[PDB]
Amino acid sequence: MRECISIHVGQAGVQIGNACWELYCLEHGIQPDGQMPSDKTIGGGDDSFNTFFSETGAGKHVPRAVFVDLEPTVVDEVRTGTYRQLFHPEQLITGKEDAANNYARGHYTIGKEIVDLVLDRIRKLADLCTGLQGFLIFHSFGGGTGSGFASLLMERLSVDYGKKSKLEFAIYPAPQVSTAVVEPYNSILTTHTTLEHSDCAFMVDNEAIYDICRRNLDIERPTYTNLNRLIGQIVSSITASLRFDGALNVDLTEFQTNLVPYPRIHFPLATYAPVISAEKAYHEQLSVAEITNACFEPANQMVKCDPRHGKYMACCMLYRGDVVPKDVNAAIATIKTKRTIQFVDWCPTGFKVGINYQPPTVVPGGDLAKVQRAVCMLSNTTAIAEAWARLDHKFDLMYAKRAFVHWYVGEGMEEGEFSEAREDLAALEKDYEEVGVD
Amino acid sequence: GNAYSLLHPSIFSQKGVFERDFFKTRSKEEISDILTNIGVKLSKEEFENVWNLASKKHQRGEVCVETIRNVLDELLHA
Amino acid sequence: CIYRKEYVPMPDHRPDFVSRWYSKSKMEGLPYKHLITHHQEPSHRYLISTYDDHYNRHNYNPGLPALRTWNGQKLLWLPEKSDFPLVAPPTNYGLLEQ
Amino acid sequence: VERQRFLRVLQNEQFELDMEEAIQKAEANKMLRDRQLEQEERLANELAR
Amino acid sequence: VYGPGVRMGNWNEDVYLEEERMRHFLEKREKGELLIQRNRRVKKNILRPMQLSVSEDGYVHYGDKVIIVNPDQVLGEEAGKFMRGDLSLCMSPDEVKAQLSDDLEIPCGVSAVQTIAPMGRNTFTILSDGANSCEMGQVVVYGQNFCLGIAAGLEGKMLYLTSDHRTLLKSSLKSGLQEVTLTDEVTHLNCWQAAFLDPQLRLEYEGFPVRANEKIVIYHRHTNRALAVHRNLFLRTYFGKEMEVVAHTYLDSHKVEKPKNQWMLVTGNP
Amino acid sequence: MREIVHLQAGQCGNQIGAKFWEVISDEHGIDPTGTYHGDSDLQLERINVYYNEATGGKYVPRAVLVDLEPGTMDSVRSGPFGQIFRPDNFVFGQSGAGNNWAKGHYTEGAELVDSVLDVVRKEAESCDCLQGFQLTHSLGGGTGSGMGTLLISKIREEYPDRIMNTFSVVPSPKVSDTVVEPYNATLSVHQLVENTDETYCIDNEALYDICFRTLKLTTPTYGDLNHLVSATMSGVTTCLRFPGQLNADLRKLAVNMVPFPRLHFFMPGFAPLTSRGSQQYRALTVPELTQQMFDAKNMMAACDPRHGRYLTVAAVFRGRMSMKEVDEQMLNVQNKNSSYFVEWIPNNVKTAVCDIPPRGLKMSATFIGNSTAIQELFKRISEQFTAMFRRKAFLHWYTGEGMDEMEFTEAESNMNDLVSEYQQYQD
Ligand SMILES: Nc1nc2c(ncn2[C@@H]2O[C@H](COP(=O)(O)OP(=O)(O)OP(=O)(O)O)[C@@H](O)[C@H]2O)c(=O)[nH]1
Ligand SMILES: Nc1nc2c(ncn2[C@@H]2O[C@H](COP(=O)(O)OP(=O)(O)OP(=O)(O)O)[C@@H](O)[C@H]2O)c(=O)[nH]1
């Protein structure tokens, strides 16, 4: 049937993995114990949770996700949390050693003796599954342990399972903020390894996420509780079609086909329009028109790219809530009449609509608004090549003065693989330029 | 009163009845008959209990038109 | 710690469903299907067959025979038949009951 | 189960929604117009007296 | 940008359209035609609280109105979703057909609910087989044939518990076992026999009066099976969720019948 | 006797057939459960053209539902009339479509055509003698286009002596949602042209205009749009089931509309569409329908034939009419626009009168049109095809499935041949 398996690598992906599952248990009303009230939804494990949880004859909802980590601090502490009884113990893949921000350590030193264990989980997750459309991979480009460890496993799961989708979600490196100077090393290393195997990589940047917080949400001092909630809301919206129906139902398989124009480049951008404070929701109104302007307002994107410096290829709007096609089709028609939005002449139509009736609900102790009409805007534009153009001119400087190489060559690596990534990258911009040229 | 009460006065104010009449002094049994005359039927037990509470809330102890109607709504809400 | 602080659960947060049902109600208009396209006055039965009327039923009984004489706009023989019979059991032959 | 669940609530709600607004507004208007007018006149006329 | 009182021309036209329908749906339902009026009246009849017979001798007599209950038993090995408490049998009508007609489905389903309060849905009148000239008020005897009837809130028509040898067309919905139904027809399939709790003492207790409020085992005369209720199998019906009730004999390791077919005859409390 | 078996294809056809069948059922007075309430004899007589008889007075529809995604027919089954549809007729797949034309045409179709062919031939043996078949789907409807093109191909050699009625909706010209939609349409239409005999052309945008024009309710439901097309589809079928001096056979009609084999694409037309005042402000007369019947605004199928001219016109009139008003009207209309027809064929009108009105309105009609207004349709899809095929965008999927651009070569060339054919016949 309609199910998938979620993957969360590194401590960077664990607390977002917690938050998403924390969010998920709300709309289904999952008690932290693992069971409903005396009302009956338990059985052979088949209801709205069957696509997400495994609430078998034992009656306990088992999330179909894997948390893999290499440092026991956070994973053991969350194992002392509140929903830990829901979580499977050795599914909470813990580790005793770190990768020291190094891709190779997580890819070579320790990943060998750990991937066999997690593959045992995946196959034993696979056998009970029925359709398993694909996977949900949550990671980070600047992965202290997320980067290297994910890269090997995605190689391993691609080779044995090359007939199903693999969905990638990672925080894009901050273009001007660098919490690590080895971060560019592993980040481009991950990209060149993943371009030929990753199906759909979705990125986001936290700086603009904060920028939203004190612009319209009016929060000058948020936390991960909010940040994880926003992205957890984002993945919830895309998975609402899996949970609920609508006027038309859409799936990740359609998303892949209708979003990626050509091979290699599979990196669109996501944006959520109704981002507003509860009071700013209270004394104003939400409708398709203004939110369409908002989601198409250049400053509402979480990635630092000016759409007027690029051009648009694909756009997907996922209207979750109470909407009618009449105003939507008229509103998007007005958008097509807009001159500033520059689609490429190659695509006359580039709009993928997914209508879902279900209103996006609030979360207890949350900061979101009371939304009746919401949309997730997935788009791909040429204004992103600057990010890799930003990456390389940092990288080329450091490479010539070959900083920190003694660390990497000391642990057994060499210059060739580093050399490979740049023309792999240099291929990307020229392809981006060539596709940019009509 | 303010121009708001002059430009938008209650129905009382068009024809010459005002707040001093509300706050003025009158007697127990007379208003009970008047309350029947104004079309509200009452019981004796309700009369005295209302009378007890009204004197308490007034902080002095008396009968005023506002006091009588206000405690009615209090009981009506109660 | 704030990590445990946001883990503090709370009851009475009931994930309802009613917004489903209103939104669903808006995407079909269930009773409207016989209400969108109904025309003129409601009528439970109106049907009858032309052969039955002209041949079997011998046409409209309550009609006045000489309902045709000098009229208004067309000051001549007119008001005879544009209405046509509609009444009486149309679908009541013996083979149905058997 | 979902089908049978679907039926009543759709029929149910429309019933109560229709009838409740039918009564609520109907009465809510009437006694207010009644009570405010009837009380004022009878109380205020004797105030003159 | 509109809606409350704008009285705009299209808003003018729209508000009418539904309104005559609101009148139209009004008069249709003002005739006592509303579905939930049907449901409430049927529920009103079904949920009518009854008055049970009170046994003065401690025994049971024909014509008595009793509630049949499977008592709560402390079983520590039924792993799964087991339902605690005393379970009383209750007729389970079909939800869809109950909406279409005020008359109960000619055959009716059976169920057991965690309810002890006397009511039309769980009150059963014990009756003779008809073939035996047993008078009303006569004590019931072990090994005798008889019928379990329920007046399901309907004046003049009487429902009798039924069961037949399981076929491929007639079986329990969940377990695929011999189903139990309620029919107004009087057949030999309506013959039932209460058995003493101890199988090793049934022959000793044959021909004896049956005491009030005690553990017994009931058997279908025509099929010779004990009435079974599944405290782990949930059925969804018109009032919510209850437990499956079938006719099958479950024996323990010692060939002794399980807690499942142990049934309580519940008489009125004086 | 002569009967029809229906096929429900594509995910639109799922909402199409659900609305279309209930339109038939309530018209024939059967309760949602299925126990017919005997009130009308002629519908009780002529129910065997579409419905067969189960036990206890239940009229089993002779339709087959096919899809891939469980949720759709589950919603259809959970509809008010799902109980009148058969789980036997619920054939489907265990795969998500991807809404790829080739997968449903080569990959997913392979393992499902066997079962569906068994179902239809069992249904074919269930009934005696068919006029033919009709299909509800979309030309731009990915899973429907993939299955339909396969099934219409196979049923051709199966029964090349029947009626291959087709009912497909044209996607919105301004936006197709699906970006590979013009590929799917071009793929489908290349198979449609040679395999079909009848085709209804329907577009959603014109329906939205009708919503704005006469419906005037701002926000309809897609089911209301389903209700409109089903009413039009019902009207043409009223000929067969109902008596009255009108020759009902589509073959009667088909030879009357079709001068040349390539003419398969036809546009519908419907009769009184009524607004708020006009349910009680309309003097219902045969004249006043006609200008509304012959209203470019009333036209709903593709576009205005004002840009072109009229090849064949055929309208079926439902209600208590007579031979003369349609006659003098037919005289009136040809007088109004004599040159707008073709000197090729005079007297290009084919009229039928159904004496049995519908339930709710008395004097109604339906129209089917074959005018020279389809050029805008496939000329539009032509530039779209040339645009993407210029740089073969979104092509790697079909090659991964096993398709090539070299197949696309004749599909447009066949389509280009149709461009001249419609042009040359008229211009
Ligand atoms: N995804 C995610 N990133 C965070 C969070 N908080 C801070 N970050 C940023 O995400 C990055 C985490 O990447 P890494 O340090 O490589 O994580 P890792 O590979 O799992 O291994 P560690 O070095 O032990 O953290 C840090 O550089 C932070 O700047 C969070 O909650 N989630
Ligand atoms: N059922 C339905 N279909 C719609 C609606 N609006 C537009 N459509 C179109 O009708 C077409 C026909 O559906 P199908 O033939 O079943 O399409 P499919 O093969 O499942 O795959 P897609 O065409 O890509 O959706 C779809 O492609 C939709 O684009 C609607 O409101 N309901």
Side-chain angles (χ1 to χ4, degrees):
Chain A
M1 61 79 70
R2 190 180 187 181
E3 79 265 35
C4 275
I5 300 296
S6 188
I7 306 298
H8 308 259
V9 65
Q11 69 275 1
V14 304
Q15 84 304 0
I16 68 181
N18 301 139
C20 293
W21 284 122
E22 296 155 7
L23 297 174
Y24 288 147
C25 71
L26 273 295
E27 73 273 19
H28 308 95
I30 317 291
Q31 284 74 5
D33 51 35
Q35 280 194 174
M36 295 298 102
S38 67
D39 50 2
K40 268 68 54 182
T41 54
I42 299 169
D46 203 340
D47 194 10
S48 179
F49 51 84
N50 68 355
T51 186
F52 277 92
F53 293 99
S54 298
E55 201 200 22
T56 52
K60 299 303 183 293
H61 322 81
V62 173
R64 297 193 176 87
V66 173
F67 292 167
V68 292
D69 189 19
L70 273 297
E71 299 90 325
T73 314
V74 293
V75 63
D76 299 351
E77 189 271 331
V78 67
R79 199 165 319 133
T80 304
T82 50
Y83 300 102
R84 74 284 188 198
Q85 63 281 28
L86 287 165
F87 297 106
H88 190 295
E90 46 274 23
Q91 173 270 330
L92 294 174
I93 283 294
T94 180
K96 281 78 72 175
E97 313 81 7
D98 69 330
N101 290 318
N102 179 354
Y103 173 100
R105 267 62 166 266
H107 197 259
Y108 296 89
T109 61
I110 322 295
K112 313 180 297 293
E113 46 275 39
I114 311 306
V115 65
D116 46 356
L117 271 65
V118 306
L119 281 167
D120 179 68
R121 326 290 295 167
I122 301 299
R123 60 89 174 173
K124 93 179 199 310
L125 269 293
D127 57 25
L128 56 91
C129 284
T130 56
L132 192 153
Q133 284 79 56
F135 309 107
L136 283 72
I137 295 97
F138 298 96
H139 49 297
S140 71
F141 291 102
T145 67
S147 59
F149 182 76
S151 57
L152 188 135
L153 61 89
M154 61 79 71
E155 286 302 293
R156 295 219 64 179
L157 59 90
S158 65
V159 297
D160 76 333
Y161 304 141
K163 296 317 150 295
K164 62 182 67 64
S165 68
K166 283 83 180 176
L167 277 296
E168 289 75 39
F169 320 90
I171 178 73
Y172 197 75
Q176 50 91 24
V177 163
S178 176
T179 65
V181 287
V182 177
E183 186 277 318
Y185 277 119
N186 68 16
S187 74
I188 296 89
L189 286 172
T190 49
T191 58
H192 92 271
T193 50
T194 49
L195 60 88
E196 69 278 22
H197 287 96
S198 165
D199 308 345
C200 295
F202 297 162
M203 61 304 298
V204 72
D205 198 74
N206 53 321
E207 301 163 332
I209 296 170
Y210 176 73
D211 297 335
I212 301 299
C213 279
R214 80 290 187 276
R215 268 185 284 170
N216 54 8
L217 269 295
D218 304 331
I219 319 293
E220 80 286 16
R221 305 291 96 178
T223 66
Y224 291 171
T225 61
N226 296 115
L227 270 63
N228 305 342
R229 199 270 171 279
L230 301 173
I231 56 173
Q233 164 273 311
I234 283 294
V235 61
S236 78
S237 46
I238 75 173
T239 54
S241 65
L242 288 88
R243 278 186 304 281
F244 318 95
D245 292 332
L248 73 164
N249 273 348
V250 293
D251 175 90
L252 53 86
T253 307
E254 294 63 12
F255 299 167
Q256 183 273 333
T257 57
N258 302 267
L259 268 289
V260 60
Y262 279 155
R264 275 83 63 189
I265 170 168
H266 51 277
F267 319 98
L269 284 76
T271 305
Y272 185 58
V275 287
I276 204 63
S277 86
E279 55 89 12
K280 281 318 287 175
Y282 151 75
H283 49 93
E284 293 83 3
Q285 189 272 350
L286 79 168
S287 67
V288 56
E290 70 278 32
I291 69 181
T292 311
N293 301 115
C295 65
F296 284 156
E297 193 277 322
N300 280 109
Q301 280 67 7
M302 283 73 74
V303 192
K304 286 81 203 167
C305 64
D306 185 74
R308 310 280 66 71
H309 281 117
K311 279 184 65 63
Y312 265 114
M313 284 73 74
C315 294
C316 175
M317 72 291 291
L318 295 176
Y319 275 86
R320 188 198 157 187
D322 172 72
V323 290
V324 295
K326 311 281 284 185
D327 55 26
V328 175
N329 71 39
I332 65 172
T334 64
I335 302 302
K336 307 159 193 142
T337 64
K338 186 70 212 71
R339 284 73 54 203
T340 55
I341 314 300
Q342 288 299 79
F343 269 67
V344 304
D345 52 335
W346 308 358
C347 59
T349 178
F351 307 101
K352 293 307 296 177
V353 62
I355 296 299
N356 181 258
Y357 63 84
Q358 165 57 38
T361 179
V362 298
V363 64
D367 205 6
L368 75 164
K370 37 196 178 295
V371 176
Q372 280 66 40
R373 296 141 170 69
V375 60
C376 183
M377 183 278 288
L378 183 63
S379 66
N380 211 323
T381 186
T382 62
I384 55 172
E386 60 86 20
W388 292 271
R390 162 153 295 189
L391 294 178
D392 54 49
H393 81 267
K394 297 187 292 293
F395 213 83
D396 61 13
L397 299 164
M398 302 326 177
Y399 201 69
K401 43 203 170 185
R402 71 279 190 191
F404 301 105
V405 297
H406 71 105
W407 287 121
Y408 274 46
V409 300
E411 59 93 19
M413 295 296 172
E414 50 263 10
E415 204 75 13
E417 305 86 3
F418 291 98
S419 301
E420 303 323 289
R422 66 181 63 252
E423 67 271 15
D424 303 341
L425 182 48
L428 296 175
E429 289 94 4
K430 73 163 71 71
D431 299 336
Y432 295 172
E433 288 302 323
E434 285 143 356
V435 305
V437 172
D438 54 348
Chain B
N2 71 341
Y4 182 76
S5 174
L6 301 173
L7 294 174
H8 302 331
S10 69
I11 298 89
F12 302 154
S13 299
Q14 287 74 241
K15 66 191 192 62
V17 296
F18 301 98
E19 69 291 342
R20 311 151 317 282
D21 313 328
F22 295 155
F23 194 71
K24 78 177 182 184
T25 304
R26 61 197 188 276
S27 158
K28 286 176 58 61
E29 62 279 19
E30 295 74 356
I31 62 170
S32 173
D33 291 331
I34 301 299
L35 183 63
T36 64
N37 302 150
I38 74 172
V40 179
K41 193 172 182 179
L42 199 73
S43 292
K44 48 186 178 298
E45 300 82 0
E46 301 173 350
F47 175 42
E48 178 58 28
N49 290 318
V50 162
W51 198 94
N52 311 146
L53 308 153
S55 68
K56 294 164 212 143
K57 183 176 73 184
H58 195 281
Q59 289 172 359
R60 297 276 81 83
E62 201 185 4
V63 176
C64 293
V65 186
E66 302 294 320
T67 67
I68 301 318
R69 178 66 177 89
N70 196 357
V71 299
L72 284 178
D73 189 75
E74 290 150 47
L75 180 60
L76 285 191
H77 181 73
Chain C
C1 53
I2 191 167
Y3 195 83
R4 293 284 194 266
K5 175 64 176 66
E6 49 89 22
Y7 284 167
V8 172
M10 71 76 68
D12 191 71
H13 208 265
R14 299 294 173 266
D16 74 285
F17 37 75
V18 304
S19 178
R20 166 83 190 97
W21 301 98
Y22 316 137
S23 182
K24 185 65 169 67
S25 67
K26 300 179 185 71
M27 65 183 73
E28 53 265 9
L30 192 47
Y32 290 0
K33 62 93 177 179
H34 76 282
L35 305 176
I36 299 145
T37 74
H38 170 72
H39 286 75
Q40 69 263 14
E41 171 206 90
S43 62
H44 65 281
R45 179 262 171 188
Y46 199 91
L47 270 192
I48 199 157
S49 172
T50 182
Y51 171 100
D52 189 41
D53 309 330
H54 303 165
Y55 301 92
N56 192 42
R57 293 181 184 271
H58 308 319
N59 311 294
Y60 184 75
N61 303 316
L64 185 149
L67 259 181
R68 187 176 183 270
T69 185
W70 159 77
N71 215 351
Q73 294 82 17
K74 326 293 182 295
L75 56 85
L76 55 88
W77 292 270
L78 293 177
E80 192 64 90
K81 62 93 175 179
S82 72
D83 188 75
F84 315 137
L86 59 92
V87 68
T91 69
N92 300 82
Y93 57 83
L95 194 143
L96 290 194
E97 61 86 20
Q98 70 88 22
Chain D
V1 167
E2 292 190 350
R3 175 197 68 189
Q4 55 85 34
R5 268 190 283 191
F6 182 76
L7 313 166
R8 279 87 67 191
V9 295
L10 264 295
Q11 296 108 32
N12 269 303
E13 289 297 327
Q14 301 306 111
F15 310 149
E16 304 100 14
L17 300 164
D18 292 332
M19 61 79 71
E20 193 67 30
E21 65 84 29
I23 52 170
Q24 280 172 306
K25 284 74 172 173
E27 59 254 8
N29 303 134
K30 63 174 57 87
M31 73 291 291
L32 293 168
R33 308 287 80 74
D34 298 334
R35 188 172 176 91
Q36 299 307 111
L37 295 175
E38 63 200 55
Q39 283 178 162
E40 186 284 322
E41 294 287 331
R42 289 171 318 224
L43 69 88
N45 60 30
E46 55 82 16
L47 294 174
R49 301 287 73 74
Chain E
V1 299
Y2 64 90
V6 69
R7 199 62 204 262
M8 183 278 288
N10 190 6
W11 182 257
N12 288 356
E13 187 268 6
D14 294 1
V15 66
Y16 293 105
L17 296 176
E18 313 92 20
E19 263 157 357
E20 293 83 4
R21 297 291 185 269
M22 295 299 102
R23 279 83 66 192
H24 301 120
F25 292 109
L26 269 178
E27 305 100 13
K28 303 165 196 135
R29 308 289 78 77
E30 293 179 353
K31 311 300 187 292
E33 299 295 327
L34 186 46
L35 270 296
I36 65 171
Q37 290 173 330
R38 308 195 168 167
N39 296 115
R40 276 153 184 165
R41 298 174 322 215
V42 172
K43 269 193 172 179
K44 187 176 178 185
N45 306 352
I46 286 176
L47 308 161
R48 280 279 57 66
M50 295 298 102
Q51 292 179 15
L52 294 174
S53 297
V54 182
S55 170
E56 315 187 7
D57 61 348
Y59 296 104
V60 296
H61 316 87
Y62 279 103
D64 280 344
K65 277 71 63 180
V66 308
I67 298 183
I68 192 66
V69 171
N70 192 260
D72 195 10
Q73 198 151 342
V74 188
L75 288 173
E77 294 184 346
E78 286 188 354
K81 313 324 181 183
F82 55 90
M83 295 298 102
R84 300 190 169 190
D86 297 337
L87 268 293
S88 60
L89 294 175
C90 56
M91 61 79 71
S92 65
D94 175 31
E95 52 187 356
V96 177
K97 294 175 180 178
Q99 307 164 20
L100 315 160
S101 57
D102 274 320
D103 283 318
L104 269 297
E105 193 192 289
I106 140 96
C108 180
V110 307
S111 43
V113 69
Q114 292 173 78
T115 300
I116 311 166
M119 152 205 77
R121 199 201 169 193
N122 63 0
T123 303
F124 293 99
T125 310
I126 194 67
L127 307 166
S128 175
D129 211 346
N132 292 328
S133 55
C134 293
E135 301 179 349
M136 73 291 291
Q138 180 177 1
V139 193
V140 176
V141 162
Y142 277 109
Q144 198 172 4
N145 289 359
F146 53 91
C147 306
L148 276 296
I150 177 156
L154 302 152
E155 291 176 354
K157 47 209 169 279
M158 187 66 203
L159 299 183
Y160 294 99
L161 188 153
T162 58
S163 179
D164 185 15
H165 291 284
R166 182 194 53 69
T167 71
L168 310 179
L169 314 185
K170 298 183 178 182
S171 70
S172 73
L173 272 300
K174 302 295 185 185
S175 65
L177 289 177
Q178 163 159 0
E179 66 187 5
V180 176
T181 49
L182 283 157
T183 75
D184 54 342
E185 300 184 352
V186 183
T187 74
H188 66 276
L189 306 172
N190 298 127
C191 306
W192 321 108
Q193 294 196 320
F196 186 70
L197 191 67
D198 194 345
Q200 298 189 344
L201 304 175
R202 53 98 176 162
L203 189 53
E204 302 79 328
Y205 281 79
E206 189 171 3
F208 278 78
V210 176
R211 292 169 181 174
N213 310 289
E214 200 156 343
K215 297 181 181 190
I216 60 166
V217 189
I218 191 66
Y219 283 94
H220 181 196
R221 183 58 170 183
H222 170 82
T223 60
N224 206 14
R225 291 205 187 170
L227 183 63
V229 65
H230 300 286
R231 294 177 165 255
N232 306 336
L233 299 186
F234 311 114
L235 59 83
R236 180 151 188 141
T237 54
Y238 182 76
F239 310 98
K241 295 284 306 277
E242 298 155 327
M243 311 317 293
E244 193 177 40
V245 178
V246 300
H248 175 262
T249 315
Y250 285 107
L251 302 179
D252 66 0
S253 46
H254 307 281
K255 298 185 177 180
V256 183
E257 188 273 325
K258 298 198 178 184
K260 287 190 170 171
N261 311 268
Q262 302 173 9
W263 291 98
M264 295 299 102
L265 72 83
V266 184
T267 46
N269 196 340
Chain F
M1 61 66 78
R2 269 166 181 213
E3 64 271 9
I4 295 296
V5 167
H6 167 256
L7 277 300
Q8 181 162 142
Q11 65 86 16
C12 79
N14 282 0
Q15 313 83 46
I16 299 297
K19 212 66 183 287
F20 173 67
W21 280 123
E22 58 85 19
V23 163
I24 295 173
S25 64
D26 58 7
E27 189 281 321
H28 293 285
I30 297 95
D31 51 357
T33 62
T35 69
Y36 170 52
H37 302 271
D39 296 331
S40 179
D41 60 353
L42 72 164
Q43 84 189 7
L44 182 41
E45 293 179 353
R46 302 295 172 71
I47 198 62
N48 314 116
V49 57
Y50 293 100
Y51 288 176
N52 280 340
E53 174 65 19
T55 48
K58 198 163 167 75
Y59 292 164
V60 65
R62 296 186 281 214
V64 173
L65 183 144
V66 55
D67 203 7
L68 294 184
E69 201 282 310
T72 66
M73 71 295 278
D74 292 332
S75 63
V76 171
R77 182 50 193 84
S78 58
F81 277 95
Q83 63 281 15
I84 205 65
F85 316 129
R86 303 287 75 74
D88 191 10
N89 290 327
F90 301 159
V91 60
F92 40 79
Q94 300 330 303
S95 69
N99 170 33
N100 185 288
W101 182 94
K103 299 293 184 182
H105 195 100
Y106 301 84
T107 312
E108 304 313 316
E111 68 278 17
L112 59 85
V113 287
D114 54 358
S115 175
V116 306
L117 286 184
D118 304 328
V119 170
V120 299
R121 65 181 49 100
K122 287 189 294 285
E123 182 65 37
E125 296 297 327
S126 71
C127 50
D128 300 333
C129 287
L130 290 146
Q131 290 106 357
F133 324 110
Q134 90 281 37
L135 174 60
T136 58
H137 78 101
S138 165
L139 61 90
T143 312
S145 58
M147 64 183 73
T149 48
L150 289 184
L151 271 296
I152 66 172
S153 68
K154 294 183 301 291
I155 67 180
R156 278 320 298 281
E157 73 258 9
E158 272 156 41
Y159 318 100
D161 312 322
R162 304 296 164 89
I163 297 169
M164 284 73 74
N165 178 3
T166 63
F167 182 76
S168 178
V169 62
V170 184
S172 158
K174 70 184 184 300
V175 56
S176 63
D177 187 4
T178 304
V179 305
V180 75
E181 170 273 323
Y183 276 141
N184 311 121
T186 47
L187 289 164
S188 63
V189 70
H190 178 78
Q191 287 69 252
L192 294 181
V193 54
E194 78 278 19
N195 299 131
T196 190
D197 56 16
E198 200 285 324
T199 297
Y200 307 112
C201 296
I202 304 93
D203 180 71
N204 49 3
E205 298 187 11
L207 294 174
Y208 301 137
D209 174 358
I210 303 299
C211 181
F212 292 164
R213 202 35 50 85
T214 174
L215 294 174
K216 288 282 198 181
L217 75 164
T218 77
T219 53
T221 70
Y222 173 75
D224 304 334
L225 283 76
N226 296 115
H227 189 74
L228 305 185
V229 292
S230 61
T232 68
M233 187 66 204
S234 68
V236 70
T237 61
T238 55
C239 301
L240 279 297
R241 63 177 74 87
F242 294 129
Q245 191 155 6
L246 73 164
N247 298 324
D249 183 8
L250 272 300
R251 195 150 66 203
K252 274 291 182 173
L253 306 177
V255 301
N256 285 138
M257 283 74 74
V258 180
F260 298 103
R262 279 76 62 195
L263 276 301
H264 312 263
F265 293 98
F266 307 120
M267 61 80 71
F270 197 65
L273 281 299
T274 303
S275 194
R276 166 58 172 197
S278 64
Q279 293 82 18
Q280 52 80 30
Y281 284 145
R282 194 161 185 172
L284 203 69
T285 66
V286 185
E288 61 91 19
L289 282 72
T290 305
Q291 81 278 14
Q292 197 215 17
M293 183 278 288
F294 189 61
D295 263 345
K297 307 292 106 176
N298 201 3
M299 299 301 104
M300 74 291 290
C303 62
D304 201 356
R306 160 73 276 167
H307 317 95
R309 282 190 296 168
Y310 307 144
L311 297 174
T312 64
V313 287
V316 159
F317 293 98
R318 196 179 168 192
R320 322 292 305 109
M321 283 73 74
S322 182
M323 73 291 291
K324 54 200 72 68
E325 54 269 27
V326 65
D327 186 74
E328 61 86 20
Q329 187 274 330
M330 183 278 288
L331 265 292
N332 298 334
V333 60
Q334 52 81 23
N335 297 324
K336 182 252 192 183
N337 50 355
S338 309
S339 66
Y340 294 165
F341 317 136
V342 296
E343 70 275 16
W344 208 243
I345 177 60
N347 295 82
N348 55 351
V349 59
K350 309 297 167 284
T351 71
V353 186
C354 169
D355 57 355
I356 299 308
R359 325 276 63 71
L361 72 164
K362 309 306 158 285
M363 161 165 57
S364 63
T366 176
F367 174 70
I368 193 66
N370 184 24
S371 174
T372 65
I374 299 90
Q375 309 84 355
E376 302 75 340
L377 283 76
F378 50 75
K379 88 168 193 285
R380 270 194 70 259
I381 209 71
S382 69
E383 302 96 9
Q384 312 298 344
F385 188 86
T386 60
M388 41 187 173
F389 203 76
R390 185 38 190 72
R391 269 177 270 217
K392 62 92 176 179
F394 296 109
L395 179 143
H396 76 78
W397 286 272
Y398 284 139
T399 51
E401 197 277 329
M403 295 298 102
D404 58 354
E405 55 84 24
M406 183 278 288
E407 284 179 0
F408 278 133
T409 55
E410 73 276 14
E412 51 87 9
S413 181
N414 188 6
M415 183 278 288
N416 306 330
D417 179 28
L418 269 297
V419 182
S420 61
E421 174 260 339
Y422 281 102
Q423 183 275 337
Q424 201 280 333
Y425 282 170
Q426 187 272 331
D427 279 330

